């Protein structure tokens with residue numbers, strides 16, 4: 130059995146998707162229709178570093194992920210399971226037939242606007258400590274406005290919360306054995322109950338759409354279990370205010386009997402996470 134993994138923010142790069150745009154002109158033009166700019170120019174030329182601005186990053190990654198998937202479906206057998214990292218979930222649900230290409234793109238455009246417009250708090254990526262050790266350190270250092278935002282591998286965790294606490298935790302984390310601690314360039318403390326207003330707004334936005342049942346199961350970042358057909362809105366809206374349970378999602382699939390994990394989209398970010406999850410499991 131085989132799973133496709135769709136990457137999210139952080140995996141974008143100038144020049145990405147070039148060959149896919151060439152091969153899928155209809156979807157390239159349809160994407161332009163939703164966005165109002167050339168999607169190819171955004172990805173290839175990266176005008177004014179817009180690719181690092183989340184309201185453009187998210188559409189770019191969605192389109193490249195979606196076209197990467199369709200290329201794979203022409204050339205090899207369908208996957209048995211799908212999973213996407215944050216933005217990646219939207220491309221996973223597109224692949225599963227939950228919504229059409231345009232709808233998915235409209236949803237990520239809105240997601241990018243909400244997250245770009247978000248204010249308050251920050252985030253840091255931590256390499257070299259497990260979840261338990263991270264939780265212990267937050268406690269020990271009195272960081273009661275900081276929580277775990279991403280569980281990406283057994284040694285890769287993202288934390289999220291009050292800006293001053295995110296700053297102050299760096300040295301103690303490094304002294305505890307973190308191989309790297311990097312304060313991220315983001316608008317706000319994503320993936321905490323802090324983002325509840327954005328969650329509510331996105332949920333209400335999603336009421337205006339009509340979804341179809343997934344034809345291939347999609348593992349939710351919120352639950353680390355397959356999305357229910359009647360729970361698409363909760364899975365997508367609550368995701369932005371909930372911890373991203375990526376490591377658990379991959380372990381769930383391994384426990385189900387999935388042996389092959391393939392990254393579907395630009396880069397090798399999820400491939401590297403998979404190597405670490407598999408090495409530990």
Ligand SMILES: [Ca+2]
Pocket residue numbers: 336337338339
């Ligand atoms: Ca509806």
